[PDB]
Amino acid sequence: ELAILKEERTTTPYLTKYERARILGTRALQISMNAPVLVDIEGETDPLQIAMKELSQRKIPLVIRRYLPDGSYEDWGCDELIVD
Amino acid sequence: KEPIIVLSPAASSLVRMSNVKEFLQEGKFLDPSKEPASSSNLLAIQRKSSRFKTPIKLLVVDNVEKLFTKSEYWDRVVAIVTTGKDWQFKNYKYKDPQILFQKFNGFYFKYKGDAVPASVKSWNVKVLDIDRVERFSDRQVVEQFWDTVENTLVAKRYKS
């Protein structure tokens, strides 16, 4: 009902800076709470740096839910949003 | 005698023998992981430049063990592509990376936004960035690479 189908999604296909910041913060917190890491870590130790490395490779297992003003929403995977 | 361009046989290299021709010559970048592996370790490419009246023919070599029996071949080397790995240089003319990189042009290809390896930052090599999504900048990156290579070729007074 409220969910919007993937074919009719009309929001921007890019990761906004607020979404990028929130995704990085959440992923860093989750990694700091011993969540599995989906990318190989060479010598990195900072959770924020690991989160940025995951984001650059489109490996973050999170979904953005963008709320339209009327209450409907669109679910975008972080692996399908374009990041600068 | 055609000049030689040396590529890293590492599997993590963004430029391999499979996609080197379409990248350096045609200017279009393809992901080498999806491309099938190339059986031939020798390839020839053509470069068109405003600095030269005629296109230049160059030889691309992945492994120098079977193609660098003579020392005079090292005089033809105009570019070296490395993945930041020390073990590439076990059989090279200068087994130490530093001296090799002051005596030869070193290039490292990385995706835009990725962090440079520590050994690469400690070496005298150029850094070339390829965007993951937009494909119009591939020609620009190739142009930078060829600008450096052509500067080296003109400095060597090569005849074509």
Added chain:
Amino acid sequence: GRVLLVGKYRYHDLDELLVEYVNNVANKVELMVSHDKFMSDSLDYVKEWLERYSKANGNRSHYIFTFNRKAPGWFFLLFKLNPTSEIKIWNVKALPDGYLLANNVYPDTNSLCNGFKTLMSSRR
């Protein structure tokens, strides 16, 4: 792991291991296949062909190479001195530096053949 071991061979990363071991082994396997004395068919067919060729050419000793289907990465060296001599099979391992036969490393297929002939002459 920071250190990788394949038998006595020691490597430091997956790419180093791959390039130094697997590529060299594949090149040596191709050289063995491209060699004039190679036959990839079944072992029984190889034995039959060797028997026929020895019977037709009983003035010389004939040796051929074939795949070791039971032990991957190896090769069976079947040689028959004469039609009256039994077919003897020797084990050859495809190593990065060459071929291991009778605990001896031969850089190329021709060197392996020369070493096999020298071993036969010395043991004779």
Added chain:
Amino acid sequence: PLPVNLRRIIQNAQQIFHLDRAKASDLTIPEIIHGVRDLCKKLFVLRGENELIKEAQQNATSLFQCLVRARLATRRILEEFRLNRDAFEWVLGTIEAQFQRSLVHPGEMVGVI
């Protein structure tokens, strides 16, 4: 004040591709016309196939399209800037990407700003 600086893009292209020298361009006129015409339809401010959405999208970029067509005219490209082909696709791609990067981000608290 208008988005994406066109003069900077053009001189960057000239420096990148070495567009000096009296060399003749290989850029055909139909390529210029069709490239600029197609570029003036990829400046997405609003997504969607709705007719009212398309009308709003066309309205939102009128001044910028006027700027782009003023700069990337056929005579100016062939004579004043002397771009070749590769420079031309590079300029078009850069214009599109920079315009996409210059949009406002949903979630701005523009009232406080």
Added chain:
Amino acid sequence: QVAGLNVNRNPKFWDIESENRDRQEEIDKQREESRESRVIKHPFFHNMKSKE
């Protein structure tokens, strides 16, 4: 000092066999552990069986 109790374990009135059997049951339970899969990031790495 583990079996510090002085309970008479006479086989006539004590089922030594049952207590022993339960003892290997609980010891095998202690031996029981858990294992999980391994995840590696490499272009030529694939989580497949030998036949796969």
Added chain:
Amino acid sequence: MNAPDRFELFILPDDVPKLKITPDSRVPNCIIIKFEREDHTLANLLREELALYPDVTFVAYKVEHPLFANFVMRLQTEEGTRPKQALERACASIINKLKTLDHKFNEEWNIKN
């Protein structure tokens, strides 16, 4: 309250080496030397002595921050000469200059006493 101890300007901690040398791989035959608990007094002397050697092609130094007592020096010699040998030659030469200066001053002072 937060003022550091004054003896930290010249007293060297046990775990801190007086002199750390690391190569500079960007250019051939170059090293970076980090002097601890030193300042312009030694640095300027060494720099101006080394600048006169024909086999030294680049010498410089900088004090990163006045509140920390250390300086870092960049030295880069010709192909034949190792930079550390040039640094040793500079030190010995300045020592000889100071020695002859002291001898001459003593002679003059005795004459004019």
